[PDB]
Write an enzyme that holds these catalytic residues in place. Structure first.
Site, PDB file in Angstrom:
ATOM      1  CB  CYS A 151      72.013   9.520  43.303  1.00 12.51           C
ATOM      2  SG  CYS A 151      70.196   9.427  43.195  1.00 12.51           S
ATOM      3  CG  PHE A 202      63.557   8.563  42.633  1.00 14.72           C
ATOM      4  CD1 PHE A 202      64.853   9.009  42.840  1.00 14.72           C
ATOM      5  CD2 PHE A 202      63.314   7.203  42.726  1.00 14.72           C
ATOM      6  CE1 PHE A 202      65.876   8.118  43.143  1.00 14.72           C
ATOM      7  CE2 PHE A 202      64.336   6.316  43.041  1.00 14.72           C
ATOM      8  CZ  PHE A 202      65.620   6.773  43.242  1.00 14.72           C
ATOM      9  CG  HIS A 290      72.711  12.846  45.870  1.00 14.73           C
ATOM     10  ND1 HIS A 290      71.980  13.427  44.864  1.00 14.73           N
ATOM     11  CD2 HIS A 290      72.119  11.672  46.168  1.00 14.73           C
ATOM     12  CE1 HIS A 290      70.983  12.624  44.547  1.00 14.73           C
ATOM     13  NE2 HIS A 290      71.056  11.543  45.332  1.00 14.73           N
ATOM     14  CG  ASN A 323      67.065  11.680  44.811  1.00 22.27           C
ATOM     15  OD1 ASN A 323      67.750  12.188  43.923  1.00 22.27           O
ATOM     16  ND2 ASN A 323      67.288  10.466  45.288  1.00 22.27           N
TER      17      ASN A 323
END
Lengths: 377, 383
Positions: A151, A202, A290, A323
Site C-alpha cells: 500500500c 480491499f 493512502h 483501498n
C-alpha cells in the site's frame, strides 16, 4: 534540466460493483459461512463503520464458483489466483494507461520508460512486459517492475519515475499502479480476524500517470511538480504488518498498534520533508493520503490536525473506490485536480501551492512525495 | 545533481557453504527426489550436466533440508509455504554477507548509504528483502529502497540501470545494490511431463553479489572499479513466450522453449549496435564482457554471433564453471572475477586491459539488459 512533472493521470476499475450495504450478505454467502453468526455480526459492524460506500471487483460469485479454493479459508488457491491476476492486472493497467495517454495527447512512441507497481499476482515476464506489448510501446522502453511493495507502492512508483525522468533528457515515464483482490480474498475464520479488516476495504483499481521533466509547453500540460521523494522505516515498528505469499494466497497479519505507530511518527515525516522549504502549517498543504481504511486516515488527520477540506479528496476515493492498494494515492491526485477545476480554485492542489502524497505500508514504511500545484487561472 | 557518471566503487560476493561437484549432481538429484526408477530422465540429465560446463555449485538446500522439507523434492506437491519459510530469511542473510564484503572494500561507514536496490526471484514477502538487509546492516531508516522482485536472469542489469539513475540524480548518493538467488524457489524433482526442469536443475545455483554505486568518488577511501556510461533494455523481436515462469503452489514453475538460444543469438548484434554505435565502436572483440551465463549454449551462441574470442569470455565461463547460474547475481560475480583476474595477470585496466566493456543481462520477454561500461586503470583502482 528541471523537476519531474505529472503531465497526465488516468484511472480504471472493473465493471462489477458491490455496494458496502450489500457486501456482508454477499461475502458470507459466497464463502458458505452463513452458519458463523458472530463473525457475520462482527463484519457488518466493520462495514457499517468503513465509510466505503462501493467497490469494484473482477472477482464475482461466478469466478469464485469456478475457483472454489479462493472462497475456502486456507485452501490451496494461489495457482487459480495467478491464472486470473497474470492477465487481468496488465489488462486493467492498459485501460488506466490509455486514459493518461489520451490526456497527455502525445504518441506512445515518445514513452521511454515504464514503471508498473502491483502486489496482485506476479509472473515472468511481468505486468511491465505485458502492458508494453498491449500498448505497442517501443520495444526498447526502460522498464521498472515493482512487485509486492503493498500500500506504499504508489509513493515508490513516483519516486522511481522522478529519478528516471530527471536523469534522462526528454524521458517520458508511463507509471501504472494496479491491484486486484483475487490476491487477497479470504473466506472468514475465527482465528484470523485480520481478514475481516481486509475484506471491509480491499478493492480493484488501476491508475496511470505520464511523468516528464522539461515539459514542451503548451502542448504538454503539467498538473503537479514533484519536488522531493522520501522513504522511511517507522521507529519501533518491526513486524507491525507482515504478508506471506503462501499456497492460500497473500496471508497478512496486522499488530494492534499499526495505527498509532504511523500516527505517533507522521509529524516527524512531515518535518523531515517540509522543514527545508520552511513549512510547518500542515493545513497549508493539499493531500493524497493512502486510504488504508478509515482508522489510518483518521489517525493521520488527528496527529497532523488536518481539517475536513484537506482530506475530502482522500475520503472521497475511500468512499467511492475503497483501498485499491498502490493505485489509491493516484486516484486521489486525479480527484484533487478535478474537484479543484469544478470548485473554480486557483491551483490543481485545491487552491494551495504545496502538497503531500503519503504512501503507507509494511516495514512499517512511509513514502512522502512533496508536490507543488500548477495554476488553473 | 549529477557532476558525473555512476561508478562501481566496490563489489562483494557470498555463497552458502554446501558445494556439490557437477560429476556428483545427477546421483544426488535422482536420489533426493526419490526418482531412481526414472532411468531415461537420469541418462538425459547426465548428458545435460556433462554439456553444462558447470563444474561446481553452492546450495543452501542439503540432503538433510530436503528430508525435513520433502514437498520441495516431490514434483508438483504444494511446497511454496516451506520454500518461503527458507527464502524469507536466507535471501536477506546471504545478501547481507555479500554486502558486508562490498562495504569492507568501500571503506565508508554504512550511514553514508542513501539508497538500496535489491534484486531476487528467490522468494517474496512484505516487507521485502530490501527492508530486511536495511535492518541487518543497521542502515539509516530513511534509505530510499527499490525492491526488484521476480525479474529473473536479466535483473543484475535492471539493478545497475536503477542504481545508475539513483546515483546520478542524487548528489552524494551511495547506492547499495544486492542481487541474491536461492534454488529453494526453483528446485523440482524430475517429471516426464516437465522436461524444462532438467535444464534448470543442471544450472541453477545459490549466490549473492553486492555493489556500492556512486558518482563523484571521494579519496582517499573511495576508488572506482568501473564507470557506468549507459544502460539499455529491449524486448527481442518474435520472442513472445520463449521463457515463461509462474509462481505456483509447487514453487516457481518455468518453461524454456528450444528457440531461446537462436532468438538471443540472432538479435544480440543489434543490441550491441544500439548501445555502441554513438561511441563509434563496432569491433565487439575489443570490448570486455560480463555476459549472463544462462547455460553453456547461450554463451557459446553469443560468442559465435559477436566473434568473441576465449579471452573475452573467460571471466563469464569461469563463473559458470565455479558457481553455475546464480540468476541475478552472475553478472556481478563476473565483474568481480574480471577485475580480480585483471589485477592477477598485471593487466593495465580492471577490464582485462581494455578500455570499453558491456554487461549483458538475459531473461524473460525475451529481455536484454545492456550496461555500457568503461574500465579504470589498475593504478587508480587498486592499492
Amino acid at each position: 534540466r528541471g523537476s519531474a512533472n505529472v503531465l497526465a493521470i488516468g484511472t480504471a476499475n472493473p465493471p462489477n460493483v458491490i455496494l458496502q450495504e450489500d457486501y456482508p450478505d454477499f461475502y458470507f454467502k459466497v464463502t458458505n459461512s452463513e452458519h458463523l453468526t458472530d463473525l457475520k455480526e462482527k463484519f457488518k459492524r466493520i462495514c457499517v463503520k468503513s465509510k466505503t460506500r462501493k467497490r469494484h471487483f473482477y472477482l464475482t460469485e461466478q469466478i469464485l464458483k469456478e475457483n472454489p479454493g479462493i472462497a475456502t479459508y486456507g485452501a490451496g488457491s494461489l495457482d487459480s489466483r495467478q491464472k486470473i491476476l497474470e492477465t487481468e492486472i496488465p489488462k486493467l493497467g492498459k485501460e488506466a494507461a490509455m486514459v493518461a495517454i489520451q490526456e497527455w495527447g502525445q504518441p506512445v512512441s515518445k514513452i521511454t520508460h515504464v514503471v508498473f507497481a502491483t502486489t496482485s499476482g506476479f509472473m515472468m515476464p511481468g505486468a511491465d512486459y505485458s502492458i508494453t506489448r498491449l500498448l505497442g510501446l517501443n520495444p526498447n522502453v526502460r522498464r521498472v517492475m515493482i512487485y509486492n511493495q503493498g500500500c506504499f507502492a504508489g509513493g515508490t512508483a513516483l519516486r522511481v519515475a522522478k529519478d528516471l525522468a530527471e536523469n534522462n533528457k526528454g524521458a517520458r515515464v508511463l507509471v501504472v499502479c494496479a491491484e486486484n483482490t483475487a490476491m487477497t480474498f479470504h473466506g472468514p475464520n475465527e482465528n484470523h480476524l485480520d481478514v475481516l479488516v481486509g475484506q471491509a476495504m480491499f478493492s480493484d483499481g488501476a491508475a496511470a500517470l505520464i511523468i516528464g521533466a522539461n515539459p514542451n509547453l503548451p502542448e504538454e500540460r503539467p498538473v503537479y511538480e514533484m519536488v522531493a521523494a522520501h522513504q522511511t522505516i517507522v521507529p519501533e515498528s518491526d513486524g507491525a504488518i507482515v504478508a506471506h505469499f503462501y499456497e492460500m494466497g497473500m496471508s497478512y497479519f496486522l499488530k494492534e498498534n499499526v495505527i498509532p505507530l504511523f500516527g505517533n511518527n507522521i509529524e516527524a515525516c512531515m518535518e523531515a520533508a517540509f522543514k527545508e522549504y520552511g513549512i510547518s502549517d500542515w493545513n497549508s498543504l493539499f493531500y493524497s493520503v493512502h486510504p488504508g481504511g478509515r482508522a489510518i486516515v483518521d489517525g493521520i488527520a488527528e496527529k497532523l490536525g488536518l481539517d475536513e477540506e484537506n482530506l475530502k479528496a482522500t475520503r472521497h476515493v475511500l468512499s467511492e473506490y475503497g483501498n485499491m492498494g498502490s493505485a489509491c494515492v493516484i486516484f486521489i491526485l486525479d480527484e484533487l485536480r478535478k474537484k479543484s477545476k469544478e470548485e473554480k480554485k486557483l491551483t490543481t492542489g485545491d487552491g494551495k501551492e504545496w502538497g503531500c502524497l503519503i504512501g503507507l505500508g509494511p516495514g512499517l514504511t512511509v513514502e512522502t512525495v512533496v508536490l507543488r500545484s500548477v495554476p488553473i487561472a
